[PDB]
Amino acid sequence: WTGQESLSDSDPEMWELLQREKDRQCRGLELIASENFCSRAALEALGSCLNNKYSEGYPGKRYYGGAEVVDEIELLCQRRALEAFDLDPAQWGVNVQPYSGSPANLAVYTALLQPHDRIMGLDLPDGGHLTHGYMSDVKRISATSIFFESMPYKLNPKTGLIDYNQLALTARLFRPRLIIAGTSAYARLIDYARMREVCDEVKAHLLADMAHISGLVAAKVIPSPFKHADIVTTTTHKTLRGARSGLIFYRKGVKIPYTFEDRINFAVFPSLQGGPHNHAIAAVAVALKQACTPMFREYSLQVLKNARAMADALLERGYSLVSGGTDNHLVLVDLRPKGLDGARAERVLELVSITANKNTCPGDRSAITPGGLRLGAPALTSRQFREDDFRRVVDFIDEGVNIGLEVKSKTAKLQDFKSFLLKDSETSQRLANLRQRVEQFARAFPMPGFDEH
Amino acid sequence: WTGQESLSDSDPEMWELLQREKDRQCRGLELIASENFCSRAALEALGSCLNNKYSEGYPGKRYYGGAEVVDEIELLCQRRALEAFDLDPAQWGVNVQPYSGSPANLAVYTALLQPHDRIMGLDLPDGGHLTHGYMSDVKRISATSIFFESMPYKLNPKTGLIDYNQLALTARLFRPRLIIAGTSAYARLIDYARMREVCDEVKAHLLADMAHISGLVAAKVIPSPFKHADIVTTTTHKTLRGARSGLIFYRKGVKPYTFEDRINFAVFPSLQGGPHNHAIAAVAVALKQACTPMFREYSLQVLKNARAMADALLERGYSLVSGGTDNHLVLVDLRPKGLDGARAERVLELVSITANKNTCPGDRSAITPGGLRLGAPALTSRQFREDDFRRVVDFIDEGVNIGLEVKSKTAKLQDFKSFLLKDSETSQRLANLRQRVEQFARAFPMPGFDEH
Amino acid sequence: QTGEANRGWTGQESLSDSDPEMWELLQREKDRQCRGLELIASENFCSRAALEALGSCLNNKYSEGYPGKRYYGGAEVVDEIELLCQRRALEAFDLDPAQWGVNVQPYSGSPANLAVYTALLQPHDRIMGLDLPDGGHLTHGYMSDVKRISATSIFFESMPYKLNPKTGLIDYNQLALTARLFRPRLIIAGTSAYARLIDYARMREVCDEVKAHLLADMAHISGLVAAKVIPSPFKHADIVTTTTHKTLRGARSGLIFYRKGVKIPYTFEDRINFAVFPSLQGGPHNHAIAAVAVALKQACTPMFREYSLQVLKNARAMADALLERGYSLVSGGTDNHLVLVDLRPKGLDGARAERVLELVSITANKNTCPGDRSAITPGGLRLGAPALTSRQFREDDFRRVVDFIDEGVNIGLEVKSKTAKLQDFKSFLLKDSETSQRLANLRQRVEQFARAFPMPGFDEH
Amino acid sequence: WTGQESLSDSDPEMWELLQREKDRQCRGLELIASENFCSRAALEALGSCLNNKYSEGYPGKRYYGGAEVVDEIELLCQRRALEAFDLDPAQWGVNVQPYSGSPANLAVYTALLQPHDRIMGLDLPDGGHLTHGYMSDVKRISATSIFFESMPYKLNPKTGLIDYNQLALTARLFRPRLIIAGTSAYARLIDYARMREVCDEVKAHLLADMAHISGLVAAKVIPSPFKHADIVTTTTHKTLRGARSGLIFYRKGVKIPYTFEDRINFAVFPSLQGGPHNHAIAAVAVALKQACTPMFREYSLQVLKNARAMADALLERGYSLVSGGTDNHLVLVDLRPKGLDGARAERVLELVSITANKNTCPGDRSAITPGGLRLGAPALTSRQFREDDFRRVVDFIDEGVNIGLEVKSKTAKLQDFKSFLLKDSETSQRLANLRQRVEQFARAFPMPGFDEH
Ligand code: NA
Ligand code: NA
Ligand code: NA
Ligand code: NA
């Protein structure tokens, strides 16, 4: 045995699965706002001999020898991360070891808070992320709500915007040690200056979790959270278009000096993680260099234009939008004026090769049948979609919604609806016709990555 | 821009760095017991379009659609994991989403314990892992010691073996909810039956963290912790020779066990976000390899090579902690030789031999380790046999002798290290040894791609 | 060797003979109590009968455990006393023993609350109480912007609720809003500086919505509740704590009442009893239990209802007299035993006022008012009726008390016009001859007035 | 109504109960080692107008005015506490507000430890106290084990002595922040110097909880824990013969100063307690002044002589003693060689007006029928008992044990044994005859306190 045989020769079962996934990505319309298509160059670094190296510790301060090259790679990744976000290295440092976005946030909390210290994030049904402290009325769900004490803040349900007035009021009472400014399903720009005002008043750290928007920030097409935040976390995928990994940025130097750096680095290792994934660090460095280019700014400008074109086309077809529009990469569609809930809509769309996700709307009464859908522009913009192409996407979505409305008129519960899509031959024929047109359209656009896997 | 450009064209700076790391791996004698060389097939899956799919949740119970293929891949990985360890799915389930070994352990604790509940693991200087609950006299180090309350168990310093008698005595007083059986620097086999006896008496869960030994267990060349443990965690790299990732195995069915739902919920939604599907696929590739006669032969050769290394060190007057080995590694006590592990590790590094300094029972300075930890897995993957490991030991002995000379000429550890670099006679001696080491190592095959 | 050098110790000697130093101190404290105008709303004067039980051989009995379930034998009489105290507590509050139980062992009010939290909550579980500056108690979970003050905020996670600053009333709307976000496991309805009646029905509505326990901490008002002169928290709360002193006029101790029987049964009783002992306390103080039983029997009488009605009338008369003299009241008046004065329009803060009053033998407390800009200089004064009502003060006597207070406020205003910082004000009261003479004159008049009224307890100690 | 009426006139029901308890105390033989009889002078202070005064805070630092006299009383109590224990006020302070012994310990833990910090105390069945951190295999029992993390240390079962070697071994592993030296059922002197050695090695605070022995310490008839512990708690009752209350002593001054004083005072108030019980503080001060006298030293010497006389009389009759003897105020009798367990024995004794308590012995298999009895000398020594009188006490105990052995031979379960004592005419007559002789003997001795209540 050599371990030099190709995947296609040595594991045909897995090779066929990879090819099937690649074909699915190429023939569908990917509208999941957290999805993107990573470059071949980054993937070549991800599947490299860097996987083999144990390098616990930090550059120049490792537990094991033989780290001279991985030290250069980790330091290069740090420099490229600061450059991508236009950060003065005298004022900011970065930890490039977090395994993903969720590990990055957990490390921040572990670094800066004692167990049971208080955090506030946007509530999950209102557009926040699990790792911002989510628990339900009946059990603690995120580990952030088990090891720490969380209390959510809310949207103003009338406007769909974060209710900064109520956040200021409740933060004075709850006294959080850390407030998280960052979202998973929010179409507007966060008022980071207002968030900093609240944090300064109550003496909380401001963490900006920019995972969804990090590429837009790097491209300077929206305002930067780094102007106001103490700590910034992000994934390296999503709008940054890298391999899956995480980053923690922190202020350093004179504020009396900042005291984040040593605590953040210690929390990542030795407290929480083990050996870094050097292949991921290298792939991230490749993507961060791409994020510095004029090409990436044009891409990010096009993401904003495409989201806006999608929002406009939906308003023209009788849909509503939570918060009335978008200033970023995604759109929050309110399907309630159409009479079809988001659980039914997402499934019809899935069966015609359009991937979107159901989304809770302000005023919804049931989590099983939420009122809306979340639609994103990053992934298809990476396939060279322009505004006219996103208008064609909306035309396909509206066709799918119309099929759903007819199935709704012939079915009762969500389970009946779902089985009908598969069991009713007439419905099945209509979905197949729409799927063929969607896939013929989608296949005509280029795709980042390898050719077949 | 297409995103289809080759790394070598689009990022020459990074491409040169990758090639330099590959050259370092090919020219060195890798004796770090936790290191291995992953196959090209697994690396091809690791750097694939699977990176591009968000699949929070579990097969058939995802948050998002479009998961039909990733569902098949995750289910296949689960099946191959159970097959590699000879497990009946009626008795065992597996979660293939943990991002690494340390995330796997944290998910077990979060699943089964409340904050501040008690755990016992082998102390770090005695051969346990950070994630088994390590804190020092000075501060809480592992997050396992922050979110939970840990108390270590110890080696018997006279034998170098886990002191099962004292573990039982102290577990009765401390009342842990979970005891960890698993090591990072131990050359003998754990008495899992005795660990089960202690856990049954005090009503604690038994977690076996088999990360260091997982390939040996899969190959059935040493006894299996699955005979006795409630939960088993492991890395997918190290002796399993896969991409970096983790696994959690758990008992299910009649005992009924109530681990499955808690374990899966702790991984997601409690701790992690989207799975790394490219890692899951790469792991599945390596697990299929681990089921083969090839892999049993590999693991048998790992044991033979560790024994050959131990025997060669004994013949040259080295002492071994616990007197020898029953697994993939050797624990050398350099104290009787007159050189400590910090000094030896650095000399060896400078001649392209990577090993680990290692705390020994007879150490008198809690700061400077007395020994070295030497492993056979990585070089065995390069087709090294017993005679080749005897040659490795001769190179080590040359390096140790250089270290002894430098020690006689220098005071502090930092003075020793600087002397290796700046004393011209010493650097010439190191250069000569490095060249013989590297020309020996380069002639063996290497798993993976040709140049990166 | 004669006299005391020829007399063996018996432990039966009188305090006045065996410890003259302590006897003189006790008499000095009694004289201070008799000659002052006690306006601290949490103060009262305990009966001689209860004090005779408090200083008794019951001090000598260890009785860890509960009646019929003790660790040690010889408890037959202390069992009867503890059971009698329980029965009298339920009787005083008109409670059916099939629906309510009571634990009579808590050492004081603060131990009672801690036992409830320990019984019903896990460490770090969430509690909400009225904020301290807004009229809550420390034991309802107080921490400052700077550190954790009450042990309730250390072992549990507290978040306050607030007054409506414009009305001076508890903001029930905001409590409901924030309880939905914070998700408390227990909400406390009870105050230390609040002049109005708590809407216990609304508190129970909030608790039912968010699935929290409602604890009523009625320490300040317990006598008024027993006398049925204000509405009872027992109509809406499932746990009630109280001190046995204050308006109940007993020895210092605590009580925990809890629902029991059919709710499917309630599950409070065993947890509450176990938290008191063995979890938190050691041997009960049987002398205090007996003294409490004496006071609880007093609280069941027509005499005590007339006392409690007079407390209400006297607080109202004090409030009216203050309004007639130009003072402002937080919430505009009182429905209970105390009055919250807002001195800000008069131009004198509560720290200055409280110190002037103390120097003329009137004890009151400075009190934070809504809108205050400094805790060192709170805007108000809290004035209570229970203690002087126990000395047979009636409405006209409280009007005379207000006349004295007004003279003290006027002295404070004059000193304020002559001094800068609070420390300068305080020093001026002692060192300026003209001011000290004016204080001495007012003090003489206060003390002759106060000494004329009767006093519960022993004659001289 | 004046509130000046006597208890006998105003509450005849309660008055009769007080008289019945007084008669029970006078006619019985009190052998509970934690019991004593408080002086009339202290009781007169306890039942005084000091009950009426709210004085939250500390002398000169109160929340409310009018505290000039209670300030003098509290300071006098502090001075008398330091005098009773031979302490230099420049080196030691004391907090006199704890409501009882258990509140004193909880305040120390709250002052010096964070929630979930580690404590070690002697296991409850081995002679420790609940408040030193007791939990069973199935439930956390003491609040000390809920809010803090406790692990017990043990006796050497062969010798009946604290196993200092095993304490040192396990303290190195468990890393307690505080170790408690103090017992509720131990007949030997604690090696405080060894305890301090262990604490110094592992960097733990040493707390001496001297509640059982405090009067012996004050009288200087046994060695003082203040030579080796820098924090000491105690009850003010038991061997100190005061009203029920607690004390916390702590080192202060140059140690770089000690930092105990402010943390301990803050923990007592405002953290844990409310208004002090000034009547108890005054009663404690009265008892502490008594504890400074030659009278009290002679009393305490007699306590030791009486416990030794009791032990020797039991040994002469063939009883075994746990640890083989006594060095303090109590005796641990092992009844197993006689064939009668402590639950059976304690109940027979109770029915003849002798109060003792069953006590777990090393090797016992059941807590329902422990092997021994704990017998104390303080209470009867306060009634002028001397050595010959304790020999008479042992004569009565032995008669009771013999009755218990006869009943045991005629009955099966513990419930049958207990029923037989009440329902068998011959047994009830034997008990009545012994009870009459015990009570005739006991009534002849004097009694501290009031005449009838
Ligand atoms: Na329908
Ligand atoms: Na040297
Ligand atoms: Na002024
Ligand atoms: Na029998």
Short mmCIF file of N, CA and C and ligand atoms in Angstrom, two decimals, chain A residues 408-412, ligand 1:
data_model
loop_
_atom_site.label_atom_id
_atom_site.label_comp_id
_atom_site.label_asym_id
_atom_site.label_seq_id
_atom_site.Cartn_x
_atom_site.Cartn_y
_atom_site.Cartn_z
N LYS A 408 -51.81 23.22 -2.04
CA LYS A 408 -52.46 23.59 -0.79
C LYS A 408 -53.97 23.46 -0.88
N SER A 409 -54.55 23.87 -2.01
CA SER A 409 -55.99 23.78 -2.18
C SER A 409 -56.48 22.33 -2.26
N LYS A 410 -55.58 21.37 -2.43
CA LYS A 410 -55.95 19.96 -2.55
C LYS A 410 -55.48 19.12 -1.38
N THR A 411 -54.88 19.73 -0.35
CA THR A 411 -54.33 18.99 0.78
C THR A 411 -54.67 19.71 2.07
N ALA A 412 -54.47 19.02 3.19
CA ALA A 412 -54.80 19.58 4.50
C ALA A 412 -53.55 19.93 5.29
NA NA E 1 -56.00 23.07 2.39
#
